[PDB]
């Protein structure tokens, strides 16, 4: 079990760890988060008490380094840092562990929510989307724009998501205009799966990363990306059965986890009604359609 | 964006553009089967592609053979229209290609946009005007060439005849739309009006009769009366 230790909590902040969150008061004696499960990526995120603007946070994998948080009073945010001196860090952590100044990642043993939301998410793949190569962790916030959004303005700080556009020559084979627009199997299976993702685990991985950024930071372009990747599968007549079954589980847990009061902005009525009720795969997402109908029947 | 009353003069400026109307592309007669069911029989159709500035009409005749063995023909009709419009643009020298294509029904936007991805510099636009282009199959010479075709075929017309020699493109389009609106609301009356006086003839190379300026005024006046009338006969006003 791994640990993200904090130097101090100088400003009142709501702290997220994965799907958990807790409040820390200005100058409360808080020195981080312990018992973090090894084997998954994680996200630690932040909303200052004073300015609910800018949710921000860091995607990390504890197997890739010793990571600590120090508040920077110049840049005014909680910054993730790597400590390469592993004894200095283990000593720093042990002291805080002994003085019980750390909250415990509160995983219920029955609960597979986080695993189910992150099954295909990899730290090396996040690092080729969020480009900042000197660090092993990846910063994201509410206002970061996607590569595609900037086409329609700082490139270093963009979310380099996989550009999906249903009215593009990438998506539409000369001479198959009607065929390829009304049935996107070519674009899904040949253009995206076989030539970019290489397998569906990678497609599932960006889809999962997209949703989590959209839900944890209210990143609009991540929301657009998540819906686009859903719609590309649902609008394909020909999808491997293993991918349909897996998508159904993926979406089920995203819909289960979404805060009920955020359904409003984070769920696109058109995409969802299309995917569940008109698309080729309208009969292939039983678990997702059942939870959507019992939890958000207004949207439909 | 969309084309409406407020930007109506844009149709007669010097940027090449085309209207496209697909309302006569897919045409059926509906009939009873021996077993007392209903079936359709397709008849020939056409795409109505018009340069409003010049009066040039690119009438693509849609021969019933193109539906053979096809399913969902109302949806294929839109893509078939889009394919043929795209083909026509590609056939034109660059300096002759349109800068805008205005579709008269919104369901044509996506099919045309996808077929024109090679022409990112041609804007595909809808309109809010309720243009009467569906009535183009009430023009006898156009109905005839469509019904006689035995194969796919493009025929070129000037729907303004020689009018631009005497009036502007704004006035010629206004006349056309009034004639077409009349034909749509009451084809028989509209036609009786146009062909009453046998001294006025239709030149072999024209669609409408050779009216003098003064005879066009009278005609235009009678077509309004018809349209106001039929609006009463319809609404009892
Ligand atoms: C040269 O050492 C200065 C940087 N390291 C730290 O300040 C530190 C290291 N690990 C955990 C925690 Br919390 C704090
Ligand atoms: C190939 O573009 C770089 C990202 N590729 C992935 O295949 C992927 C996989 N999992 C998560 C994420 Br986030 C992306
Ligand atoms: C009134 O909202 C206009 C933007 N619409 C959204 O649905 C949205 C906006 N920002 C983030 C996310 Br996540 C969703």
Swiss-Prot record, chain A:
It is found in: Cytoplasm; Nucleus. PANTHER family: A1 CISTRON SPLICING FACTOR AAR2-RELATED (PTHR12689), PROTEIN AAR2 HOMOLOG (PTHR12689:SF4). The modification Phosphoserine is found at residue 236. This is A1 cistron-splicing factor AAR2. Phosphorylated on serine and tyrosine residues. Component of the U5 snRNP complex that is required for spliceosome assembly and for pre-mRNA splicing. Involved in splicing pre-mRNA of the A1 cistron and other genes that are important for cell growth. The keyword Nucleus applies. Changing residue 236 to A: No effect on interaction with PRP8. The gene is AAR2. One of its GO terms (biological process) is spliceosomal tri-snRNP complex assembly. It comes from Saccharomyces cerevisiae (strain ATCC 204508 / S288c). It comes from the Eukaryota.
From Swiss-Prot, chain B:
This is Pre-mRNA-splicing factor 8. The chain holds residues 1836 to 2069 of 2413 of the full protein. Component of the U4/U6-U5 tri-snRNP complex composed of the U4, U6 and U5 snRNAs and at least PRP3, PRP4, PRP6, PRP8, PRP18, PRP31, PRP38, SNU13, SNU23, SNU66, SNU114, SPP381, SMB1, SMD1, SMD2, SMD3, SMX2, SMX3, LSM2, LSM3, LSM4, LSM5, LSM6, LSM7, LSM8, BRR2 and DIB1. The MPN (JAB/Mov34) domain has structural similarity with deubiquitinating enzymes, but lacks the residues that would bind the catalytic metal ion. Changing residue 21 to N: Reduced growth at 30 degrees Celsius. Strongly reduced growth at 16 degrees Celsius. Functions as a scaffold that mediates the ordered assembly of spliceosomal proteins and snRNAs. Required for association of BRR2 with the spliceosomal U5 snRNP, and the subsequent assembly of the U4/U6-U5 tri-snRNP complex. Functions as a scaffold that positions spliceosomal U2, U5 and U6 snRNAs at splice sites on pre-mRNA substrates, so that splicing can occur. Interacts with both the 5' and the 3' splice site, as well as the branch region. Has a role in branch site-3' splice site selection. Associates with the branch site-3' splice 3'-exon region. Also has a role in cell cycle. Residues 7-237 are annotated as: RNase H homology domain. The lineage of its organism: Eukaryota, Fungi, Dikarya, Ascomycota, Saccharomycotina. It comes from Saccharomyces cerevisiae (strain ATCC 204508 / S288c). Present with 468 molecules/cell in log phase SD medium. It is found in: Nucleus.
